[PDB]
Amino acid sequence: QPIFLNVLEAIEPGVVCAGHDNNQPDSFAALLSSLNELGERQLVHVVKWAKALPGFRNLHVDDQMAVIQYSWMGLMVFAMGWRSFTNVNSRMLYFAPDLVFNEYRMHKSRMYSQCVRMRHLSQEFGWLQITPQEFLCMKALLLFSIIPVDGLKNQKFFDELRMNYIKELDRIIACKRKNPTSCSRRFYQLTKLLDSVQPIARELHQFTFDLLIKSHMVSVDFPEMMAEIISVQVPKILSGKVKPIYFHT
Amino acid sequence: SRWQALFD
Lengths: 249, 8
Ligand SMILES: C[C@]12CCC(=O)C[C@@H]1CC[C@@H]1[C@@H]2CC[C@]2(C)[C@@H](O)CC[C@@H]12
Description:
The complex is a heterodimer.
Chain A: H1 3-11, H2 28-51, H3 61-88, E1 93-96, E2 99-101, H4 103-108, H5 112-128, H6 132-142, E3 146-148, H7 155-174, H8 180-213, H9 215-218, H10 224-232, H11 234-238, E4 242-244
Antiparallel strand pairs in A: 1-2, 3-4
Helix pairs in contact in A: 2-3, 3-5, 3-6, 3-8, 5-8, 6-7, 7-8
Chain B: H1 2-7
5-alpha-dihydrotestosterone binds near residues 32 and 38 of chain A.
């Protein structure tokens, strides 16, 4: 019995609305303020999701908060890509049921280039024929893909946990394939996909940080948790104190 | 802090 998968499927977060007023014009202020609220809302689900993951509670409470604070961007973008793929077939960015981005909004949000990259990520799910099980194991692995260069409180258990989630992904690939070249080819493709998430998350990190600094001048509201994490944790990533863990060099 | 309350 696939205990691990049972857990991942059982704890997968449901639908989250942004609360966007689709009646008012597509302004930068409105679009970004709603994206910020969506983030605040999804942050709640990411925390509950993570705490329910196999072995996560073995991490020191401070490390638990740390990995979530550093990896949320990538986690949310990856799940959004999956939603877009399965809903609008990756043709539009399905941030939330009430906040779907078309080309016009991509331009209005002033993050069109970033949206293009997210669309590409979304299309990869289709191009690679990623299964729901692969998606779930890969997403779980993204939580363990960014840490401080100086290490975590109990780095050793984080290392064991990360290793186990890699083992589970490899297992999911092999649990559906007999050929070694196929398994090896698939593992290569998926680790490459995971790596591609980081550059995108990085651009969004830089973008949201800059936006926070002058949010008062462009009329963009940042919720409490988002504001705290973006001014305290994000700068640690942008300054090089916290770095992603890539599979490939 | 809603964040700490989220873990607490
Ligand atoms: C993570 C979110 C919100 C959750 C999601 O579906 C992915 C999406 C990616 C862009 C983020 C957005 C949250 C708010 C941010 C960080 C804006 O400030 C600029 C980039 C936005």
